[PDB]
Amino acid sequence: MDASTLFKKVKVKRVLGSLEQQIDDITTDSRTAREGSIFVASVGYTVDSHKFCQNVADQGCKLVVVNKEQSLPANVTQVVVPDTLRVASILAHTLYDYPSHQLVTFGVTGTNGKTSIATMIHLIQRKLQKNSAYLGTNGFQINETKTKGANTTPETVSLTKKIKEAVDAGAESMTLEVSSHGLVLGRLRGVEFDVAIFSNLTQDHLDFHGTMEAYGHAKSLLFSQLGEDLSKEKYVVLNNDDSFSEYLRTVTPYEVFSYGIDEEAQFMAKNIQESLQGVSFDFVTPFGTYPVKSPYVGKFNISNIMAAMIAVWSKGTSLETIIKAVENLEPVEGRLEVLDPSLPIDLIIDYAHTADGMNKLIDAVQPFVKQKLIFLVGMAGERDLTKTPEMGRVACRADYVIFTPDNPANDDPKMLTAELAKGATHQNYIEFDDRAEGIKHAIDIAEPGDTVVLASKGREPYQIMPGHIKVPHRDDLIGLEAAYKKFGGGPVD
Amino acid sequence: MDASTLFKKVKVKRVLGSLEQQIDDITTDSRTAREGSIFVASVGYTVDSHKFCQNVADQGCKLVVVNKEQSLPANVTQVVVPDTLRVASILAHTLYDYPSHQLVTFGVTGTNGKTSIATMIHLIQRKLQKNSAYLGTNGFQINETKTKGANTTPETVSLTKKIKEAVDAGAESMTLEVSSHGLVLGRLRGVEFDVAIFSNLTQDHLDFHGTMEAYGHAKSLLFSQLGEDLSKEKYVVLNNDDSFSEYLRTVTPYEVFSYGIDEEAQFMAKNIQESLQGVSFDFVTPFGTYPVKSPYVGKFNISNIMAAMIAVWSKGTSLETIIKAVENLEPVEGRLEVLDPSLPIDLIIDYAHTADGMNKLIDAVQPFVKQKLIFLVGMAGERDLTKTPEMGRVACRADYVIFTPDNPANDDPKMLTAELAKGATHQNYIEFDDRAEGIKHAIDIAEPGDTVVLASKGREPYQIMPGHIKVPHRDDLIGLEAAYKKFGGGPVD
Ligand SMILES: CC(=O)N[C@H]1[C@@H](OP(=O)(O)OP(=O)(O)OC[C@H]2O[C@@H](n3ccc(=O)[nH]c3=O)[C@H](O)[C@@H]2O)O[C@H](CO)[C@@H](O)[C@@H]1O[C@H](C)C(=O)N[C@@H](C)C(=O)N[C@H](CCC(=O)N[C@@H](CCCCN)C(=O)O)C(=O)O
Ligand SMILES: CC(=O)N[C@H]1[C@@H](OP(=O)(O)OP(=O)(O)OC[C@H]2O[C@@H](n3ccc(=O)[nH]c3=O)[C@H](O)[C@@H]2O)O[C@H](CO)[C@@H](O)[C@@H]1O[C@H](C)C(=O)N[C@@H](C)C(=O)N[C@H](CCC(=O)N[C@@H](CCCCN)C(=O)O)C(=O)O
Ligand SMILES: Nc1ncnc2c1ncn2[C@@H]1O[C@H](COP(=O)(O)OP(=O)(O)O)[C@@H](O)[C@H]1O
Ligand SMILES: Nc1ncnc2c1ncn2[C@@H]1O[C@H](COP(=O)(O)OP(=O)(O)O)[C@@H](O)[C@H]1O
Ligand SMILES: [Mg+2]
Ligand SMILES: [Mg+2]
Ligand SMILES: [Mg+2]
Ligand SMILES: [Mg+2]
User: Fold this and answer.
1) Which segments of A are annotated as binding site for ATP?
2) Strand A139-142 and strand A145-147: pairing?
3) In terms of domains, do B332 and B310 share one?
4) A388 and A355 in one domain?
5) Which residues line ligand 4 (CB under 6 A)?
6) What are phi and psi of B65, to 5 degrees?
7) What's the CATH number where A391 sits?
């Protein structure tokens, strides 16, 4: 469509050159701007991409959106605006014909549980034979096709393009993880949600938000930004076991569905039975109480699966049909996965990376420890360290603790492991600068009948190293390789 | 329409009795429930209206929405829901066919300036010969027809009904004052806004919000609740002279128009000339700079009128035509009105009732004081007193200060005036339990050529007294009557 039409949407602009040209692309990354692209320049944490306008011109781009007039050949049109990224979201949603309005969109936010819930919703939709897309930490997925990405909630143009890809692939719904960063930074501007789901609010990301108050307020935006049009069928799904839900009710007019285990709620889990092979519980609902069998491990995953079921139910699918679908749902990659159960030890991977997440992981696994719990965890580089010793304390619930860096980036890895060590409550721990070395050590220490847990990465396939360089790393593969060496078994070679 | 259709909108409900009946009315006030009404019961600060269901049944109402099953005759249908008021807003907007979606809606929030801006927008629309409605502290107005009300932002059902009245009267737009109370309490659930306008955030209402942080976050809801549908033409108008605007930008994706006097902004006022008869200024805009003549007094009203002009402009009216309309706009009742200029004193009424508002009032009037400034102010009963001595300090910018109660309700009036007195910085003040007595005293003290200001009530026609009883009271009429007695003039009698 033509640039004229697109920029009618923008009231304050200084236009230098013609808007007659056809536009089929928008990008905030100069490296992909071409003839027919709009390149929107912006100020990042690393570079100001206004510096790259000449590059995009060389590549044939004839239209740039900028905060200040640039030095460029006269045949490149410049649109000067006060807020380039705000305009990028307007342009992108317009160009792609409002992709978020074209399918059912589910959004999940919370300190822990975003990937779990979002993936469970996706997997339920697929079990119901519906085309479904997912975007989050585990990347972008349309039905069974997966590609990895750099963020949980990617920057606005990339994100909008992916919603448009889901629409074009024929998705009936798409579920997005909604990071508090993404909300505050405008990455989700223009993304209309139909159902908003909350897991919990516990201490994290204060390097970015400064305070718990600001952090909670950031997550509330997913709920208030649903808007005020009561002719729309929109719904909010809240966790009554988290006290922040009381506040969330006040910021949106749409009907609220509550779930709970400890606290009274509209949907509850009772008579919970746990195993390393999944759970059963009685699912109390406003319409009746029904037996549920779930393949997921732990009470925290009962909260998560209830959130997922209620979200799908809210848009018109019968609970009976959802409960049937949940029974043999596939694993959520990296989230409490029991590896090769034929081993003479329990070998579990999990993504726990905050104190609360670790407590929930250990709560779930500990009842099944026959002998000793061997627990490896990493601390992420370049993140707030204030709750790191607390993570070290929680880890010392285990019998033997291994501390490692996780994505140390430019941080000294020994500083990360030493910070974890400051919280230890017993002397049975060890620190490794190299996480792979730490994993092999965990297997060295493990006896038949022991339980080994590798926490904070799941199957995340890299360590972010100095210069922010990704080096290949797989907890699961390193763990298994070390385990087969020690105990035997494993596929032929 | 029939109750069945209405309640299809509510997913969690326990229905006792038939929904076949016709519904033409909804009410949260039992006193107006009749056959064909839905009565929604709720828990207020004073009474739980669930107690009144039998009354509504006696009056012929056959449908109640309740949080718990009630004792009622079997022929009354009960719909039991978890959140009655949330359902009231859903039912009301549905029943009245989404009245806020049917005209352009402007919403104004801020500590001071809501009535001023909202009224200015209304008056501009009328000057442009467009049907316009206004709802706020000065009541409900459709074109020139006014009725008074109990709140700035009335409870959800009454508010929705008034939007529906504006639609039915043929209004092309309606402007609502948006109180932080109204936002938090859900009074505006279902009210879609097209333009949101911010004035300022200064200390007020902490008896309700507890903190400035929570208070600011409450006002941010007007902006985030605009939603995320970028196919809609919605706009945000922010004051760059207020530091809270930086935060407000982050909570909405829509284009932001900024105004400013002290700080750089897209729309600014320069070369400001002031009189008691209005102002002139050069209005810098993104499209050019234009001379503006405004009948309103003071720099604070220049901020307000710029906000009003930009809001109307944003929905497609030319600035030139708006600027012409502003020239002889009518007064905003109670807000810096110069009374009978034929008097040998300046006699001014104004609604200033916080420290910041008082400073802005005194800033506006002081350059025109030839001799002495005689300044009367009241403190509201049953409100947070923490900034009351500060109000007393600000008042002592005047030469002679009179302290009175304003709507003391059940508070001891002497406690209110004494709290004001604690901030005084000179000895030239006096306190009166009776505000009318204080006004007459102000005139007693005034010499020809003096300036008398009566602040905090405007033309508000009552004092709220013990038992929360309204007794007639008019600052303007009492002031004028006393002034004519002392100085002569005034209409024959
Ligand atoms: C601090 C931050 O925000 N940098 C994000 C930001 O970089 P920069 O601003 O530095 O980019 P830069 O300045 O290079 O470029 C600015 C702009 O210029 C463009 N430009 C750049 C170069 C060029 O040649 N041409 C060009 O046009 C570029 O496309 C961009 O539009 O823009 C990128 C692109 O959009 C994101 O990819 C980055 O995200 C990183 C990966 C991140 O780690 N971000 C974190 C802070 C984050 O967003 N986290 C949340 C939550 C997830 C999370 O935090 N998870 C935990 C997990 C912990 C357990 C791990 N085992 C954690 O990481 O702590 C999320 O991803 O949604
Ligand atoms: C504390 C509060 O919120 N009580 C509001 C609230 O009463 P209650 O909860 O006590 O009502 P109650 O408990 O009696 O009844 C509950 C429910 O039962 C129903 N019910 C009641 C009786 C009955 O016979 N039958 C029946 O069905 C009734 O309709 C209601 O649905 O419900 C009313 C109806 O909806 C409002 O009219 C009240 O608002 C008062 C007037 C107020 O003063 N409210 C203030 C707190 C307020 O809302 N302020 C903002 C901002 C304006 C402001 O604060 N301005 C300053 C001005 C200062 C300068 C003045 N010169 C100030 O006042 O400080 C605003 O109005 O939007
Ligand atoms: N609802 C929950 N409450 C507490 N901890 C949880 C919850 N869900 C998952 N976790 C823990 O946190 C880790 C991260 O879960 P995930 O669903 O990836 O959260 P997020 O996507 O918000 O980071 C899991 O591997 C598990 O240890
Ligand atoms: N923009 C402003 N900034 C500061 N004070 C103002 C502003 N506008 C009005 N005031 C002062 O506050 C009083 C109340 O103004 P009004 O527009 O009624 O505000 P609100 O409706 O928010 O209470 C006025 O009479 C004036 O003294
Ligand atoms: Mg998080
Ligand atoms: Mg995630
Ligand atoms: Mg106020
Ligand atoms: Mg007002």
Assistant:
1) 110-116
2) antiparallel
3) yes
4) yes
5) B 110, 112-116, 137, 177, 199-200, 300, 303-304, 335-336, 350-352, 356-357, 360-361
6) -110, 130
7) 3.90.190.20
